[PDB]
Amino acid sequence: GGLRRRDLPADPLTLFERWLSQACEAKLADPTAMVVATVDEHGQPYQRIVLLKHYDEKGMVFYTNLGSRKAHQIENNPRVSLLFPWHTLERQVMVIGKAERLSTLEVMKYFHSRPRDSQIGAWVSKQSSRISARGILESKFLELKQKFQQGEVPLPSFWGGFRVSLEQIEFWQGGEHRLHDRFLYQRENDAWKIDRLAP
Amino acid sequence: GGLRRRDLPADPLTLFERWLSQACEAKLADPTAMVVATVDEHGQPYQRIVLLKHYDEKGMVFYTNLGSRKAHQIENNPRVSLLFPWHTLERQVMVIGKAERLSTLEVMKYFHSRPRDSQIGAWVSKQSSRISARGILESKFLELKQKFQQGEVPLPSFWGGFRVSLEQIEFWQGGEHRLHDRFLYQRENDAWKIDRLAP
Numbered sequence A, B: 001g002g003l004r005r006r007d008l009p010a011d012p013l014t015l016f017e018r019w020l021s022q023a024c025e026a027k028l029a030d031p032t033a034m035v036v037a038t039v040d041e042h043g044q045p046y047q048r049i050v051l052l053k054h055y056d057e058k059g060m061v062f063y064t065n066l067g068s069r070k071a072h073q074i075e076n077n078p079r080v081s082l083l084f085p086w087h088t089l090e091r092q093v094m095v096i097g098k099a100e101r102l103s104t105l106e107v108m109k110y111f112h113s114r115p116r117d118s119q120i121g122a123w124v125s126k127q128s129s130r131i132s133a134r135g136i137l138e139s140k141f142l143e144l145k146q147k148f149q150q151g152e153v154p155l156p157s158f159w160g161g162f163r164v165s166l167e168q169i170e171f172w173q174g175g176e177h178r179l180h181d182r183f184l185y186q187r188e189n190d191a192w193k194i195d196r197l198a199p
C-alpha cells in the first residue's frame, strides 16, 4: 500500500520487528540472514552473509570465528554495514554501526545452545584461511567427535561474536515507476531523526 | 552433491554462468540482484542492492544515478564488493574489484531499452538526497510524462553506470556440519589462481 512518514514508529526497531515478523510469516529462506560488509586496511570492502541472532537497542548480534577475515578487518576498522536482502518482499533494511566484541559469558551461553555437530564443526574450521583440501575438515571433524565423547563439547577460544551498534537504519520498500519509499533513521544522541530519501 | 576442486572451470565466469542459469531456473526472485558495498571517506562501508545487467571478462555492470551516495563514494574510493545472496540455493558469489564509469554510448543503449515509465522515473529522482515528501516525486513524474509527450524520452545527464572489474571471485556452497565449500579465484595477471578457504 505504500510507506508514509506519518505511519512510522518512533523507534526503528519497532518497524524492523514488524518487517522481520512478516518475513518469517512469508517463509523467506533464512529471514535472519544479513549481508555484513567490513573494510580492510587498504580501503577494500568485503562481504559475506551471517545470521542475526539477537537484537535490541544496543545493536545487532552475530557469531563468528575470531581468526576469520571479517574479524581481522573489524579489529582494524570497526565500522560495518548490515543489509537484509528482503527484495522478494520488495524490501531492504540497511544498518550502519560499529562492531564490538561480545563477552565470554554471552558467547558460552549461545554456543552451548547450538546443535552438537555444529559445536564440533566450530572446532574444525580455521575460517577464511587457505586449506589444501576438503578432507582436512572431514578428518578433524571425525577425530573431534570421538575426542569429546561429547561430555560437554568445549567453547573454542577462537570462537566469538560481535554486536553492531545502531547509528543509522534505512528502510526501503518497493515503489512503482522506480519511485520507491526510503526512510533513514539517524541517531541524534539517544533520539532518532527521520528523513525520506529520494529513490 | 558437493563442490570439489577437480570439478571447477578454469574461468570463474563459467561457474558463475552456471550458477546464474540454475538460479533463474529455480525462479529465485531477482536472480540478477546483488548487494554492492562501497566505502565513504571516513572508512565507513555502505550497502544497497542493484541489478547486474551485463558481465564478461571485463567485469560486472550495473546502472545508477550519478548524483547518488554510491556514486559519490565510488568517485572517492573505486574499490567495491558485490555479493549475490543466493542462500535459498545454499550459495553465495562475492566479487572484489574496482568500479569504472561506463561511456555515454553504452549508457544510451541500455537506457532506451528500459520501460518508458522507468525512463521518466529516472528523470524524477535526485537519488539519495533528502526530500521532504513523497509527493515531490509524484508531481514531477506526472509533469514529465506529459512534458516529453514521450517523443523519445531523453537520457538524463545524471544517469550512468559502472563496470566492476574481476580481481577476486569467491564461490560458497552449503555444507553439512557447517563445513561449507569455499573457493577463491584470484587474478594473477590475466590468469586465475584457485584456493579452497576454510568455512
Ligand SMILES: Cc1cc2nc3c(=O)[nH]c(=O)nc-3n(C[C@H](O)[C@H](O)[C@H](O)COP(=O)(O)O)c2cc1C
Binding pocket: A030, A033, A046, A047, A048, A049, A050, A051, A062, A063, A064, A065, A068, A069, A070, A071, A127, A128, B087, B090, B091, B092, B172, B199
Ligand atoms: C545463510 C548463511 C548464514 C551464515 N551465517 C554465518 C554466521 O552466523 N557466522 C559466520 O561466521 N559465518 C556465517 N556464514 C558463512 C559466511 O558467509 C562466510 O563464508 C564466513 O563467515 C567467512 O567470512 P570471512 O572470510 O569474510 O570472514 C553464513 C553463510 C550463509 C550463506
Ligand SMILES: Cc1cc2nc3c(=O)[nH]c(=O)nc-3n(C[C@H](O)[C@H](O)[C@H](O)COP(=O)(O)O)c2cc1C
Binding pocket: A087, A090, A091, A092, A172, A199, B030, B033, B046, B047, B048, B049, B050, B051, B062, B063, B064, B065, B068, B069, B070, B071, B127, B128
Ligand atoms: C531488487 C532491487 C534492485 C535494485 N536495482 C538498482 C539498480 O540497478 N540501480 C540503482 O541505482 N538502484 C537500484 N536499487 C535501489 C538501491 O538499493 C538503492 O536504494 C539506490 O541505488 C540508492 O543507493 P545509494 O543511496 O547507496 O546510492 C534496487 C533495489 C532492489 C531492492
Ligand SMILES: Cc1ncc(COP(=O)(O)O)c(C=O)c1O
Binding pocket: A051, A063, A064, A114, A118, B178, B180, B199
Ligand atoms: C560458519 C557458520 N557459523 C555459524 C552459522 C550459523 O550460526 P548457528 O550454527 O549457531 O545457527 C553458520 C550458518 O550457515 C555458518 O555457516
Ligand SMILES: Cc1ncc(COP(=O)(O)O)c(C=O)c1O
Binding pocket: A178, A180, A199, B051, B063, B064, B114, B118
Ligand atoms: C533506482 C533503480 N534504478 C534501476 C533499477 C533497475 O534497472 P532497470 O529499471 O533498467 O531494469 C531499479 C530496480 O529496482 C531501481 O530501484
